[PDB]
Amino acid sequence: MVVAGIDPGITHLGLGVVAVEGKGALKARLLHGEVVKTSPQEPAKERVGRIHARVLEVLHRFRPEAVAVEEQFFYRQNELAYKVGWALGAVLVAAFEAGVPVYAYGPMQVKQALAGHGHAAKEEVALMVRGILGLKEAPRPSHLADALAIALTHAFYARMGTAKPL
């Protein structure tokens, strides 16, 4: 199971791809990791355009069966949420064009899947991702690490028949 995970946001976009074992305990190989960066010196449409281009390239190169993103919750819907939405919109256009389905999981679902319970610390999730990927050191930077956590979260729920389409 090849899964792309993505972590959007304002200035960075984490983009990772893992190949998960079809059987046994949750275990995966890291195929790709990057962070798409933005420039304050380019128009908004350039930032979003770059995200689309990079996501499409990764979807093309690795042909994942799924794209996984965080199900974003906001206490307040405002311009901040709107701008995170721009980045996800670019991801969705790429997924549409590449023919890859998209799934979303809440932050507590990630914590539960990777560190055992919904109140687990982000640090414990990071350590478990390191373990699942068989890595000497945990992935850096945090944006990439978060994208990988979401990809592995999808794989976990997909295996037990509870994947969550977006």
Which residue ranges make up the site for Mg ion (CB under 5 A)?
Answer: 7, 9, 12, 143
CB of 11 to a second copy, least distance (A): 14
CB of 136 to a second copy, least distance (A): 36
Catalytic status, residue 70 = yes
Q: Tell me which of Mg ion, a second copy, none is bound by residue 83, counting a contact when its beta carbon lies within the kind-specific cut-off of 5 to 8 angstroms.
A: a second copy
Give the DSSP H/E element, type plus range, for residue 59: helix 44-62
Whole-number Å distance between alpha carbons of 40 and 135: 34
> Which residue number, 31 or 84, has a Cβ lying nearer to a second copy?
84
> Which residue number, 21 or 57, has a Cβ lying nearer to a second copy?
57
CB of 76 to Mg ion, least distance (A): 14
Distances (CA, A) of 148 to 15, 22, 59, 80, 131: 8, 17, 15, 24, 12
> Which residue number, 93 or 138, has a Cβ lying nearer to a second copy?
93
Binding mask 29-58 for a second copy (x = CB under 8 A): --------------xxxx-xx--x------
Residue type, 97: E
> What strands lie across the sheet with 2-7, from one edge to the other?
28-37, 12-20, 2-7, 66-70, 102-105
Q: How wide is the angle at C-alpha 119 spanned by C-alphas 117 and 125, nearest 5°? A: 70
- Residues marked active site are found at 7, 70, 143, 146
